[PDB]
From TrEMBL, chain E:
It comes from Tetrahymena thermophila (strain SB210). Transmembrane segments: none annotated. The lineage of its organism: Eukaryota, Sar, Alveolata, Ciliophora, Intramacronucleata. It comes from the Eukaryota. The chain holds residues 212 to 264 of 422 of the full protein. It is found in: Cytoplasm, Cytoskeleton. This is EFHB C-terminal EF-hand domain-containing protein.
UniProtKB/TrEMBL annotation, chain F:
It comes from Tetrahymena thermophila (strain SB210). This is Ptype ATPase, putative.
UniProtKB/TrEMBL annotation, chain G:
The chain holds residues 1 to 50 of 492 of the full protein. It comes from the Eukaryota. This is EF hand protein, putative. It comes from Tetrahymena thermophila (strain SB210). The lineage of its organism: Eukaryota, Sar, Alveolata, Ciliophora, Intramacronucleata.
Amino acid sequence: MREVISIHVGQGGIQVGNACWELFCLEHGIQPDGQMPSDRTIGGGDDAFNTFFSETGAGKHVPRAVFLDLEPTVIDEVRTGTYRQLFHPEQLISGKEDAANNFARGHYTIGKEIVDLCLDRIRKLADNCTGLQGFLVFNSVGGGTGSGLGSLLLERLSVDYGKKSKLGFTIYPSPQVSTAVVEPYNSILSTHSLLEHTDVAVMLDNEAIYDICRRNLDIERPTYTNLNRLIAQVISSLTASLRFDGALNVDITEFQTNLVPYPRIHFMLSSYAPIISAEKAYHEQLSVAEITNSAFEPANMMAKCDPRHGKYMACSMMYRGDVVPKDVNASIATIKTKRTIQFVDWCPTGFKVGINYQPPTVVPGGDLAKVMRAVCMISNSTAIAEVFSRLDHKFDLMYAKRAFVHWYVGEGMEEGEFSEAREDLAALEKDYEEVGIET
Amino acid sequence: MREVISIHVGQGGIQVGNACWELFCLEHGIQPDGQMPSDAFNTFFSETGAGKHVPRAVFLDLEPTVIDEVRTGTYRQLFHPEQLISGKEDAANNFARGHYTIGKEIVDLCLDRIRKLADNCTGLQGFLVFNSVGGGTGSGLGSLLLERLSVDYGKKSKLGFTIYPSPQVSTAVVEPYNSILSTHSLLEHTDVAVMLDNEAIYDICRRNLDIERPTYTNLNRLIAQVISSLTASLRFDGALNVDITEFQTNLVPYPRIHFMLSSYAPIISAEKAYHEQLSVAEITNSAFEPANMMAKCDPRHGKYMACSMMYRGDVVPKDVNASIATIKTKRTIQFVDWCPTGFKVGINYQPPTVVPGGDLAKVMRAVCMISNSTAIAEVFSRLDHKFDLMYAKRAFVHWYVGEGMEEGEFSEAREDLAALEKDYEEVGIET
Amino acid sequence: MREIVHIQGGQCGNQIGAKFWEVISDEHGIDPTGTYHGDSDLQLERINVYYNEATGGRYVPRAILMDLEPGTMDSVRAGPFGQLFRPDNFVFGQTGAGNNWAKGHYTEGAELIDSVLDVVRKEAEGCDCLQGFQITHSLGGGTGSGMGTLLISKVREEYPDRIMETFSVVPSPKVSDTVVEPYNATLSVHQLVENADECMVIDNEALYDICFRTLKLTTPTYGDLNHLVSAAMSGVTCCLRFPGQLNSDLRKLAVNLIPFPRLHFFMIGFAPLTSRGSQQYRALTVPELTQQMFDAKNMMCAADPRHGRYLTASALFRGRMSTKEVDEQMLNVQNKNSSYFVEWIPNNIKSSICDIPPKGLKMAVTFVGNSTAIQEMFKRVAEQFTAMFRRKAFLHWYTGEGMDEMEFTEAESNMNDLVSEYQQYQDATA
Amino acid sequence: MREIVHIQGGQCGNQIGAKFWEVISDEHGIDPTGTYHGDSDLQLERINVYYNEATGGRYVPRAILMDLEPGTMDSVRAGPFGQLFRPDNFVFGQTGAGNNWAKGHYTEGAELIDSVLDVVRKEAEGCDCLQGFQITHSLGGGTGSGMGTLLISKVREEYPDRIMETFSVVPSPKVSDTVVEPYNATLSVHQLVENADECMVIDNEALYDICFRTLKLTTPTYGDLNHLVSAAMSGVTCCLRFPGQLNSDLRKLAVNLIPFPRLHFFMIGFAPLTSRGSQQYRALTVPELTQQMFDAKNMMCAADPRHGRYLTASALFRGRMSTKEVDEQMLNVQNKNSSYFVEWIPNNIKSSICDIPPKGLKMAVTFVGNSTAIQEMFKRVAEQFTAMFRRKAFLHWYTGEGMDEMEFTEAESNMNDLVSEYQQYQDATA
Amino acid sequence: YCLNQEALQDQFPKTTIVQKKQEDFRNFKEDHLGLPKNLGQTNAKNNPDMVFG
Amino acid sequence: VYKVDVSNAVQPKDYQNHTHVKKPNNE
Amino acid sequence: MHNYNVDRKYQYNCRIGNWSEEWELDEYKMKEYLKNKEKQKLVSTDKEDR
Ligand SMILES: Nc1nc2c(ncn2[C@@H]2O[C@H](COP(=O)(O)OP(=O)(O)OP(=O)(O)O)[C@@H](O)[C@H]2O)c(=O)[nH]1
Ligand SMILES: Nc1nc2c(ncn2[C@@H]2O[C@H](COP(=O)(O)OP(=O)(O)OP(=O)(O)O)[C@@H](O)[C@H]2O)c(=O)[nH]1
Ligand SMILES: Nc1nc2c(ncn2[C@@H]2O[C@H](COP(=O)(O)OP(=O)(O)O)[C@@H](O)[C@H]2O)c(=O)[nH]1
Ligand SMILES: Nc1nc2c(ncn2[C@@H]2O[C@H](COP(=O)(O)OP(=O)(O)O)[C@@H](O)[C@H]2O)c(=O)[nH]1
Ligand SMILES: [Mg+2]
Ligand SMILES: [Mg+2]
């Protein structure tokens, strides 16, 4: 009755989504083969797995997801592992030739022959669903197919469906730690498409996640599997109000009507707590008053942005576990008292709080330690204007002397489209400055 | 709901904190691993919800040596693992290193941990800080922490238990340079300071304890007893209770004059403590015996300003007042004219605790005495002479200058010690 | 999908090709009889990139051996693993190029290349989806340089959107064994810059230095030098055949390395390289590998990388390792040595991680760096050419086969033109 | 943490290091193959100060061995505990210095220093947090006194913030082995006084005297002298490797021992040393240890400590013992010998206690003292130098390699200035 | 031999054996891939799956 | 990395017992 | 656009195209043998018994 369809496009989305679908199976008690462990006995609460899975009629559960990519190696890993029996075989769409860090290839040359197959599958997925809340898309912007096919999908979905809310969990490049050499180009191009076609976008850069594992979890050599588990917990907490009863249930539709003051401003960054390992998480009581203090710690923000440089527009808090409503209210009063956190003038009240009864679920072989309480943050602040400013500066350095341009011009893209993307970010910067000033 | 936070900085602070926390754990019955075998402990410890207890202490250092000793010792499971802050490079007896170069990258963590600890407390009475003064990081980080906590908190009282160098027995050769500097910083930032010269405790370990080869472990056990006797009024029942805030209201005539010295009695070995009765009449007389003082100073060379006595055990209030009159009528103890009443006395019922493997005996009655007297002016005069002798020819100055320390800061520290000496001289005279 | 076809020409290229297929076969567990005898299923997932299926289930490489003299092909077929090659893919001349670029490109090469174009056409149309071509040849010999470079032009004319890759061995002034080397080297560079998508340069002088100094082996031979090149050759396509954290094909390397179309010459290197008696004293860790990676003495090229500035650089890691350590290591070297990196491009090093190391090694790295120091080879070669061409020495052989002195002037001007525009970015400022 | 790299040059330095590394390995429980076989846990906590970790669990020292003649290192590789060192760390020429400071510092040292700089830089970049360097060399030979001081200058240029140790074996005219010693001794001390942070002079005559009288053994040799020097070296830094009541490292020692920047030439000693026939008769207590400590014949230097006044002194006690006894013995010595201690500084003795004694002994002491009596060596060396220089003997031999008499005059003037300003404080009074 | 430490077409490198306390020290100081590190509590008496809170 | 990290991390257990939150006398 | 029935083909171990369906069919050929062994209808055992 309340369903969400998750789209995984690009290698970044697949691997992040790979850890997500391991967590949801654990949280609902579904084996990787798809069958429920204990037959059909009368102990099952329906409309709990209906958010993410679909009943096959007799036995197993089929997840509501589609895997989209232009390169075979990442998809074939899933089709060969132990999760081969879970997904629908014709929902893992794969191509032949990769985009190879080129935006023009994934949006003008190869993306045109794959979008038809993807949209056809989405139609079948939505037809089975009856109370579709919205869509979830995962993609790293700093890549070819992630930005190319990602832009095309939002453009096609915005006209095919219309008013359905879409949430984008994108991964922007870190300030100075980055893999590719030309990703500032196709990141700017990708930004223009998702600005006018998404309702909520979440900042999920990689450098901030490295710092969290170094300080809190005390992990000095983390691989990508460690990071993807952290994002997986955030998705679980956000959606936990759609399938578990609580004191203050908050749906998907009542997120982007409370975090979006103006239609253009929908870029916000997330935070999670407590994130602490099983060898020192067992000295502390982890009170609600102190876990909510760690949420506003600027070092715990999962985006490389300093919130102290900008005002807070609105914040969203989602507690799960055994929190008490008064204890939350007492903590919020202390936060407003603190002088280091300042809100915007025209937003007197700025907290939206939800409480759920189901505690977080720990994955065996993981790094986190399972606890009673957890809080997830989705905060919109004016400090986010700096991440686009530094990306614009990097673009200006290389586009001044036309580096790497001939790769884009030769694949059908016109020379001028680099210019139009510039004013879009420039206009976006002006809006953030305009909003932040007081009356 | 009353708490107190203890700060251990430097090797001396850490090595006295080990003994004091062993004594506290033994006194409250908490096992080394933190579990309590089958509410008064709330002053020092905090519950984890089910089982073990975490002390309200933070350990600071730049050498990973003594910290690694704690992190692998028998108390490895007691302390919070990420409040045993350790550095990489030692200050190496250089004051400028611990105040301008390598302390600024580490003071941020200590402040954050202190804020986290304070947010958990609700009735925070004050801070306790232990530090060796004749050293680099002890003086360097000690000044920075007090300076930061002042503007960070305000009216929370701070108690400092420092160890100044002995008149003639000391290890380092450049310690007169940095002892002067740290006193300048702590004078305007610490509310109560105690003198704990090493040479005095060596003699006490001899005459009373019949020990011929004392070691730093023996001294640190003496200081732990003083701390426990001072803070037992907060966490045990008694006829007359005294708070931390009820210390700086009765011992500090003027805001500048808060450097005081301590004593303890009775101190005696078990092999001869059972040949005599140890009545309250004489143990209060021994506390005023000059040879029993815990700082190498002579109280006969000056007047007294205010004396505080904390009795614990089974003392009777009538007996206490009967002995005080004897001290008043004694002619070799002189009080200042403008202080007719000079004693604030507190009584507790908990007898002193004994640590197994120690050297002390256990007695039914113990008194710990804190006195503010004008005789403490001589330790500043003798410390000034050494610094003047070295600064005449400017030895070791190039070491401090090259670490970011201005040349003119040495002179400013020298001037204010002269001001303090003149203050003592002008206040000690009669009207 | 995205398979590649291999072509080797000349004597130098054939020896390079012969050793390369020995490395690949052992990596995938292929016996000299063409039967698979590997251990893990990963050894067979991506075998279609280099191999074809035939009746009986045996595998044959899709390699074309092309030359003017049957003497060299009789030796390579007689070597071990020589029975894998298709006997119908052997196409050879009967006369010989005689180290004459005119002979290999106009008279004898032209009349023979018709036949070899059919077999390479057959191999290209048979594949599911072509990825690109790779060529191994030398720029000093006639048949390698002349008929080698003509095959590139014909193939590029028919497959424009594919990727052309060449492993080219240029001659060095120290170890020089052919007098007319400067002549046919200049003519090859002119033709190579127009069509080749990616080219890598190898120096026999540099390979000698690596063996004698680093490996400390007393008697290097041509088998040893061919072994070093072959290991680096498989590293480029290593991630195209095994799963990894960050997959990166040939096209991705092309996008991230070439800023301007005419600047596509690279120098390559391999790590780790440890002596037999000193391999029990080193520790294999990511910080250890990167220090040997950027070592100037480890380059397979005679150019000194500290005499210029790196435009772009790439490092391909093989083995199970943490991504953070790789990322923090690449940043540190770029900040500690900011003087040797060009400043108008941020983070000019690309990192890739693959989860399967070479056989016998727990960790290995292939380095492909675009640096401005390459201009030294072109300058010294041009210096040899201009002195020898002013007196018209050894010119009657080239002018005796329909090629006139106008073409020589065009090649010399083009080669100097490449250097001038290649050097101006070194002094270019933002 | 706070680890130090070791460099040894010349025959004397190599011979000293060959025994020092054996002593350290025996203390830490390391076999000659580098495999730990100890018994106590504390032997591993601070083992990374000197040793690195390789695959297989073996430990290799971070030492560099250099010379201009391969003979000494070829001898030491085959000797006991010679397999520990990494062969890549061996560096050597083919000509030899031939007791010529100019040849070892200007002609051949200049062209050989690049490789030693490369290996030193690699070793110093490998460590987590550097503490300093320590050098062993002789000032009476060519290659040592030249290349060691050149390396010291370059390392001071590259790492100006780290500490540096040198253990200098200066010549003594009572037992002279070379006829050119004063020239290169003055030349080396000129460059050493400007750069080295801590210098510790050693005299073969003093070692012979100690071995003949104190140990009362019939036939001493270089093995015994090296053993004494290595024992002193390990006693100096034991506190950096083992826990104790008071911790003190090289920086703390320097701060407490150098009052003014140009006075950093120390004399060292060890206790207790006794004849073997009286081993079962002695009583080892703190008073006896400090008496033998301040005994004049126990110094490792020819200078007489009772001919001058001590500026500062440092003692590093080893073994479990009470601190009050140490303090009272230091105070008692300073009060009983108040004539030999300078007045304008109070409490000019530093103490440090470590609870891990040397193997086979219950107590041990290393004495380091900055005494004003060291001027005698400088005076006598300068007298020999000026006597030889007045007649320009052996001078064209030095000046044919780029040097001139101006450099010799400057070195002599700097030595004289050091002597004058060093004895000035003895006459200085409050 | 230089490019092959393992896989010597019938050798296999070795299975070394040294002291145990060195292994314990290494595991206590090693910086493992993935799992954070051992911090030294490991009392082995704490109940698995007991969750403080 | 995927095979050793994600594919074989889970076992038949951890799925067996999964339960989440459900919907005077005197006188 | 993973295109199937691509002319010359390898075994299903290689992942060129339409490998998953062939693998599943081959597994099913194994599947029906296990059932035919569960019930004593195997031709092989009848040969031995006679
Ligand atoms: N957090 C996280 N980021 C990833 C992961 N994999 C790739 N990325 C990011 O993705 C960026 C590059 O895009 P990729 O994901 O590698 O590839 P792509 O987005 O599919 O685009 P193509 O290369 O054309 O296939 C890198 O800069 C990474 O920051 C991952 O597993 N976790
Ligand atoms: N009472 C007591 N004092 C000590 C002890 N250990 C050291 N001290 C004192 O500490 C002074 C010197 O300081 P250090 O022990 O070196 O420690 P520090 O002050 O932090 O200076 P650093 O060496 O730079 O760390 C000495 O003068 C001693 O008097 C101890 O165990 N007990
Ligand atoms: N690396 C390597 N180089 C070789 C080998 N054989 C020849 N060469 C080089 O190739 C150059 C001569 O090329 P040549 O044989 O005339 O080329 P061809 O005419 O195409 O056969 C010489 O300078 C050699 O350095 C080999 O086996 N390995
Ligand atoms: N203590 C000690 N001194 C040595 C040893 N070998 C040589 N010497 C001294 O070194 C001096 C000669 O140094 P020399 O060999 O010329 O130094 P080099 O030129 O740097 O190699 C002699 O006076 C010896 O006394 C040794 O093994 N131990
Ligand atoms: Mg990809
Ligand atoms: Mg210290």
